[PDB]
Amino acid sequence: GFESPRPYKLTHQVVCINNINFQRKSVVGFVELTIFPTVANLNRIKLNSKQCRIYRVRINDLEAAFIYNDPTLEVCHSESKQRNLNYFSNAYAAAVSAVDPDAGNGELCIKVPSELWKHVDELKVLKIHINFSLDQPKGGLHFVVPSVEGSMAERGAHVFSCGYQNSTRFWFPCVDSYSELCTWKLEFTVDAAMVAVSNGDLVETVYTHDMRKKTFHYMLTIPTAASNISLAIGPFEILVDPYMHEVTHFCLPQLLPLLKHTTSYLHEVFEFYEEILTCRYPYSCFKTVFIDEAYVEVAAYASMSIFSTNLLHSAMIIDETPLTRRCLAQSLAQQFFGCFISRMSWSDEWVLKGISGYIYGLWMKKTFGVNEYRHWIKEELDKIVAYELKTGGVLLHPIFNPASHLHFSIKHPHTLSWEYYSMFQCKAHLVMRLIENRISMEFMLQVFNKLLSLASTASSQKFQSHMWSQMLVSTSGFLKSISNVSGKDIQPLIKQWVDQSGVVKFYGSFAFNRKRNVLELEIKQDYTSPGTQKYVGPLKVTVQELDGSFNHTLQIEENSLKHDIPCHSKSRRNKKKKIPLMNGEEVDMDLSAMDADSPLLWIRIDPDMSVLRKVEFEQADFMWQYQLRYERDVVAQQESILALEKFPTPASRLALTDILEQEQCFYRVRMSACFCLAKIANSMVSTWTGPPAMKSLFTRMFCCKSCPNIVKTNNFMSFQSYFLQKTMPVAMALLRDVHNLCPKEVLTFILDLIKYNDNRKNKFSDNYYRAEMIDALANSVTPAVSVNNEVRTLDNLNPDVRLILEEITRFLNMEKLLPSYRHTITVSCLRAIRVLQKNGHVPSDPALFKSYAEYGHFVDIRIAALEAVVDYTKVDRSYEELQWLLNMIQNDPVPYVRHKILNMLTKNPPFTKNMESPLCNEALVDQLWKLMNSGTSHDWRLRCGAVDLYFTLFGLSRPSCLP
Amino acid sequence: PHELESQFILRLPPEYASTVRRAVQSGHVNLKDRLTIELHPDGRHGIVRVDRVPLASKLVDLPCVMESLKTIDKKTFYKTADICQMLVSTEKKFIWNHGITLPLKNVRKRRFRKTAKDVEKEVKRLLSTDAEAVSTRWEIIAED
Amino acid sequence: PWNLSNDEYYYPKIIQHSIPAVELRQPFFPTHMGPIKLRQFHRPPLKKYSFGALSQPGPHSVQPLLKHIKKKAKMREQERQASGGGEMFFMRTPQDLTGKDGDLILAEYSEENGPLMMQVGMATKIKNYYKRKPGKDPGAPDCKYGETVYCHTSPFLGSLHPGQLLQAFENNLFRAPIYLHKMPETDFLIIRTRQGYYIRELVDIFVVGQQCPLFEVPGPNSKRANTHIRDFLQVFIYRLFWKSKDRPRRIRMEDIKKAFPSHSESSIRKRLKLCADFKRTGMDSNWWVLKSDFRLPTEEEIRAMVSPEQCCAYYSMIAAEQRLKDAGDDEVRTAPWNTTRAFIAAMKGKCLLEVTGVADPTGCGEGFSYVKIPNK
């Protein structure tokens, strides 16, 4: 049951936009809302509006009086001397709650005229006509206007609606909540050479009487929220999908072949999401818009998605096809379960984020294989256990503070830190995988189909929300639908992993009792760490003995420590028979390293990742080597690679080398075995016999049979030896001699890989392989032996580093004339120059990176150069570079770059709270408090980034470096 | 508490079965007055009265075991009760040799495997008589 | 840009009972069966009531239930369409398992005493195995009940002919070929309860052939047998502790002695030793209170302790124990632990079975005998 927090119900909204002026960056328009009051004596009506100048408001064609105030413009007063962050977080939460449409509130308060009170008490319709104007928007609509001359379509100027969550208040007045569903009528009067893309279906396109402008009329009969309404106006090249004909793809001019190749996969994503769920795609059209200077890499609205143009690749670009493919896939998953089925509160957001991430993981499983699915699930689980042990924990479904261990309030999406938002979505889809583990996948897809079917029977009624609230899901409704389809309720699993905000830590060690033939496990939990919680459920453990692989369920109550499980025979060591594996197959194992008295070959605690856990198991090194070689699970091979770094014995070198030589191993395991072999080789110097590690293996796999030092000409058509070939010198460059310097046998090998590179014969580009070669050249740089702080000049350069510097100079200059796909070699060469500057080789001068961080460059070059400037101002304690970065945060045209500068200055801070630094003035405290209070008031993501930066630099209490 | 329901099969003469079938498929409570069942304290004898006409009944044991299976979707079936008795209307006499379906006829005689070495109760009575006695004399005998 | 997961080298290649059945509730799954109740196993006699409307001697009107059937079916369809229209789970209460509603079919068994048999409240599925004709085939002959599946590899011992559809009961316990027959024209179904008689007609009756067992019945005094007895007693003790309303949860010993009267009280004490303690004096006197450090297991853990199919295998074992005991080596071969072990071993390919023998439940040439023969 859904009861509105608003005293009115909104039925229909007309959004008309005229006079989109690109020179002056200005729009004019009106908005006409059709509300039905649910309570009599409505009097004031409270709507949401930011940055719009409200000209006039007429209610039922009668002139009404409005008052506007935004408390989130300046959160705390300018003349308050408070400088602690808990004060700002409480004031910011109160300010966002005072404009919240999820309460009754709002920023624009319109007073109902007196003569309509007899029209409002007996509950009859009210039609509110606001007309507004955005004079030069700092948020919401982003105007990308290039400085080439010509007409606005000839130079490539466009507008798009940017922002996250409820940010539609930034470009027209609305009820900007996900729970106020209404039908829509959208008119946009644009230039005759431009096209206006929006939500709904385009009913017509009429000309103006001078035929210089045309009006696009859109209609949206599926009741969506105001937060799902978008806009993209530009000189877009239109491409109808040749497979599905209601799907149109819009790109920027001159990028039509890239659009043709890139969006050619999307019909398979549509077919997948419509056959695992049994509902068809709910909207009547689908539109993909590719734009420049995007807010996020992929945004999903109702019947529309806005991607950045940096996803567009051609047919000869690999290492970008899977990333763009999965961006399209998660946009479509959010089309199904973020835009059609919406949110009932700010709680129950974990339901939608979990269903979106879970069905996108099912797509990844079918498309890229079960092994890529397991690797992705393991990397997400490692991400969340790192974040939750780092700071507190992520609390899905809080109850309204519920989480007081962290420096922001979790009551609203616009007060969350961006890393918390990312980990929120990550934990939501892993908890949905856990619900699939308890209640099987076909019942899970039946739950999702029941939600979609209730929403689509709801979506066709005309009753104003008598039935339109069946399109809003809640937690209680989701659990009730689960209990309807399965008969089991998941309330212990919901109580543990949703309502409780923690992950578990397992420390395991075994001992084999030879007398009674049992395996005595010893599993203890660390439950006193700040991020942890105590697990009391069951726990699966998989033991591989000589007779095969056996699963055991252990009951781990609070007082439990020793778990005795039984062991089988050892009669497959009496005769040589094959040892049967986890799957149905069996292999020949070399049992010379195994103990004579124990049959068990390896043990895995929680193999299926059925809890949110971090396992620290103490096996013997031969058990880790057997688990690396003969396991049929990629997460166990990865964890054995990760645990073999502590055992540098030559049997582990033989195990990793046998993994590296082995095709029919998953390629991301061999790419990890490269770096593990490099670390092991560095640890057993003065024992290593022959050549450096992986060199003979590289010449055996990727070089000519007649010439060992000449590499084969590039043929990248295998896509697994391409990735292994481009990752093996990067790990090989981490080799070090007894003198702690990279050997001149590996550096010469990398330089010969660079010289003899011929790419005139493959059908694929070479930009990522050459960029990884520059990364391998950067890995070999050891710190220089400066004497008496000698100035680093050209004559006293290292003889090794002069070759590296010549190569990166040649590569960067050749990129200036023949550019790569996304300037990958510019990014790699800037990263390598920063590596050479971090050691004492090149003079520590930020002027090159400051010239590459200007506005007109590509955004990857910009963020690489700004990363180099952030690293410089951390190491050299530069005041003027920090003022340069803070000025670039305040006034840069691209808001993604501002968010990225705040992000990088949070990750690599110039000082922490423990450090005494020269950059701990009252002036810097006043600048960052002014940046939290004012200055970042237009983005909701810069303000949370400024809160994160103030927390990283000065902590939760009063800045110490202050009177 | 819950008590398992006790279902049995009622077999009627064919004309009376047709009248009872028509009255059941009609569905009125008129059938309730028309059809009554009186079970005698023997336990294996009764009257079924169809339209107030008395018929003589015997509750017999069926050779196979039937099970009623209900369903909501006609794909998954849930067992509701076990049927082993039939009140045919018109000890060894209370045992039915045939099964309800056409292929199962003379099942007890032909399609049932018989393994052999009331009798136990008789042995218990004999033991009780021996206990109430004073002197017991026994001999395995021959023809006499 | 492609799959790139070497999946062919790492990975080279359902029955939901009612909530009374998975919770092992005591009318449907009895704790103890005596000798006269083991002789009447799955053949329950018509009991005389002591109190109720049918306990008074005299004529009793039967009551038609066709408004009840269609009202309950319309109500369940409203529940299903209110829940999104998909397939729903309805059997959540014991009162859902009555014969007074839903579409009843009957299922007759060919064997006298099968090796495995379902208790009341358990679910089974009807699978229509259809082998296509060589080359072109019209499609499975359609059938009123069950779902159709195309079986290249015959589930049963024989192999299906081309173009032959065979229906079968499929569950976790067995798999057995069923054959739809129409009901006799004279037989109706009388459901008697304490309140009165109720009458349904039946139209569909299946004949169930020789079962192919999928669960192994344990032997007497086996390790699996004693493990099931101990786990069943532990589950009953936990569910009595859950039912206790006292704030320190407390039970009485003679409730357990009423449920399991053949058990020596040393075994019941052993189960209560961990998780409970006896209070002799003061408050809670002569009660077995729950220990304060002991976490009583949740409902899903108690369900994971004992499965209903294990209870059916145990009931088959003790019923066969009684029948063998009453009848004073051929009979021992026909015991369900031997025949279930023989059939499951034959399905893995361990050994072969003499298909003509003495374990034949027909007693003639029809039907199989599941006793092990060597493969040499």
PDB file of N, CA, C and O in Angstrom, chain C residues 313-332:
ATOM      1  N   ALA C 313      11.225 -43.175   3.466  1.00  0.00           N
ATOM      2  CA  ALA C 313      12.111 -44.334   3.399  1.00  0.00           C
ATOM      3  C   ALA C 313      12.171 -45.066   4.736  1.00  0.00           C
ATOM      4  O   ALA C 313      12.185 -46.305   4.769  1.00  0.00           O
ATOM      5  N   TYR C 314      12.159 -44.325   5.845  1.00  0.00           N
ATOM      6  CA  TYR C 314      12.139 -44.962   7.156  1.00  0.00           C
ATOM      7  C   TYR C 314      10.828 -45.689   7.409  1.00  0.00           C
ATOM      8  O   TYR C 314      10.820 -46.775   8.006  1.00  0.00           O
ATOM      9  N   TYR C 315       9.708 -45.115   6.959  1.00  0.00           N
ATOM     10  CA  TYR C 315       8.418 -45.770   7.147  1.00  0.00           C
ATOM     11  C   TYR C 315       8.313 -47.027   6.304  1.00  0.00           C
ATOM     12  O   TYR C 315       7.736 -48.029   6.747  1.00  0.00           O
ATOM     13  N   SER C 316       8.887 -47.004   5.098  1.00  0.00           N
ATOM     14  CA  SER C 316       8.946 -48.204   4.273  1.00  0.00           C
ATOM     15  C   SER C 316       9.785 -49.289   4.929  1.00  0.00           C
ATOM     16  O   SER C 316       9.408 -50.468   4.913  1.00  0.00           O
ATOM     17  N   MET C 317      10.906 -48.899   5.544  1.00  0.00           N
ATOM     18  CA  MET C 317      11.761 -49.870   6.223  1.00  0.00           C
ATOM     19  C   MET C 317      11.053 -50.509   7.410  1.00  0.00           C
ATOM     20  O   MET C 317      11.109 -51.729   7.588  1.00  0.00           O
ATOM     21  N   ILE C 318      10.374 -49.709   8.232  1.00  0.00           N
ATOM     22  CA  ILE C 318       9.778 -50.306   9.426  1.00  0.00           C
ATOM     23  C   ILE C 318       8.517 -51.098   9.085  1.00  0.00           C
ATOM     24  O   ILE C 318       8.222 -52.107   9.743  1.00  0.00           O
ATOM     25  N   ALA C 319       7.792 -50.712   8.029  1.00  0.00           N
ATOM     26  CA  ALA C 319       6.655 -51.508   7.581  1.00  0.00           C
ATOM     27  C   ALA C 319       7.108 -52.843   7.015  1.00  0.00           C
ATOM     28  O   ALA C 319       6.480 -53.878   7.269  1.00  0.00           O
ATOM     29  N   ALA C 320       8.212 -52.848   6.267  1.00  0.00           N
ATOM     30  CA  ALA C 320       8.729 -54.100   5.732  1.00  0.00           C
ATOM     31  C   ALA C 320       9.323 -54.975   6.817  1.00  0.00           C
ATOM     32  O   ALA C 320       9.264 -56.205   6.722  1.00  0.00           O
ATOM     33  N   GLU C 321       9.950 -54.358   7.821  1.00  0.00           N
ATOM     34  CA  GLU C 321      10.393 -55.056   9.021  1.00  0.00           C
ATOM     35  C   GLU C 321       9.240 -55.785   9.687  1.00  0.00           C
ATOM     36  O   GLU C 321       9.357 -56.962  10.043  1.00  0.00           O
ATOM     37  N   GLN C 322       8.092 -55.121   9.824  1.00  0.00           N
ATOM     38  CA  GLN C 322       6.911 -55.757  10.467  1.00  0.00           C
ATOM     39  C   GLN C 322       6.413 -56.917   9.605  1.00  0.00           C
ATOM     40  O   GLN C 322       6.170 -57.995  10.168  1.00  0.00           O
ATOM     41  N   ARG C 323       6.277 -56.711   8.292  1.00  0.00           N
ATOM     42  CA  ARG C 323       5.722 -57.768   7.411  1.00  0.00           C
ATOM     43  C   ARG C 323       6.643 -58.986   7.428  1.00  0.00           C
ATOM     44  O   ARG C 323       6.124 -60.102   7.593  1.00  0.00           O
ATOM     45  N   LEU C 324       7.959 -58.777   7.327  1.00  0.00           N
ATOM     46  CA  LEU C 324       8.935 -59.898   7.388  1.00  0.00           C
ATOM     47  C   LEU C 324       8.860 -60.559   8.762  1.00  0.00           C
ATOM     48  O   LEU C 324       8.834 -61.796   8.811  1.00  0.00           O
ATOM     49  N   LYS C 325       8.780 -59.763   9.829  1.00  0.00           N
ATOM     50  CA  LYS C 325       8.766 -60.321  11.207  1.00  0.00           C
ATOM     51  C   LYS C 325       7.525 -61.190  11.373  1.00  0.00           C
ATOM     52  O   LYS C 325       7.654 -62.297  11.921  1.00  0.00           O
ATOM     53  N   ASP C 326       6.379 -60.713  10.891  1.00  0.00           N
ATOM     54  CA  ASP C 326       5.111 -61.485  11.004  1.00  0.00           C
ATOM     55  C   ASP C 326       5.228 -62.781  10.198  1.00  0.00           C
ATOM     56  O   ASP C 326       4.822 -63.833  10.720  1.00  0.00           O
ATOM     57  N   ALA C 327       5.802 -62.713   8.995  1.00  0.00           N
ATOM     58  CA  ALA C 327       5.996 -63.926   8.169  1.00  0.00           C
ATOM     59  C   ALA C 327       7.319 -64.605   8.544  1.00  0.00           C
ATOM     60  O   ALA C 327       8.223 -64.638   7.687  1.00  0.00           O
ATOM     61  N   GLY C 328       7.410 -65.155   9.757  1.00  0.00           N
ATOM     62  CA  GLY C 328       8.643 -65.833  10.210  1.00  0.00           C
ATOM     63  C   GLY C 328       9.884 -64.978  10.001  1.00  0.00           C
ATOM     64  O   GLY C 328      10.061 -64.026  10.781  1.00  0.00           O
ATOM     65  N   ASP C 329      15.193 -66.822   2.633  1.00  0.00           N
ATOM     66  CA  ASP C 329      16.013 -65.656   2.207  1.00  0.00           C
ATOM     67  C   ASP C 329      15.345 -64.975   1.012  1.00  0.00           C
ATOM     68  O   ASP C 329      15.719 -63.828   0.704  1.00  0.00           O
ATOM     69  N   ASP C 330      14.412 -65.669   0.358  1.00  0.00           N
ATOM     70  CA  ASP C 330      13.739 -65.095  -0.837  1.00  0.00           C
ATOM     71  C   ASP C 330      12.962 -63.846  -0.413  1.00  0.00           C
ATOM     72  O   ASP C 330      13.086 -62.816  -1.100  1.00  0.00           O
ATOM     73  N   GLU C 331      12.246 -63.926   0.709  1.00  0.00           N
ATOM     74  CA  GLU C 331      11.452 -62.773   1.198  1.00  0.00           C
ATOM     75  C   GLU C 331      12.402 -61.629   1.555  1.00  0.00           C
ATOM     76  O   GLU C 331      12.068 -60.475   1.245  1.00  0.00           O
ATOM     77  N   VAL C 332      13.553 -61.944   2.152  1.00  0.00           N
ATOM     78  CA  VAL C 332      14.547 -60.905   2.553  1.00  0.00           C
ATOM     79  C   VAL C 332      15.052 -60.176   1.308  1.00  0.00           C
ATOM     80  O   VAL C 332      15.355 -58.985   1.421  1.00  0.00           O
TER      81      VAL C 332
END
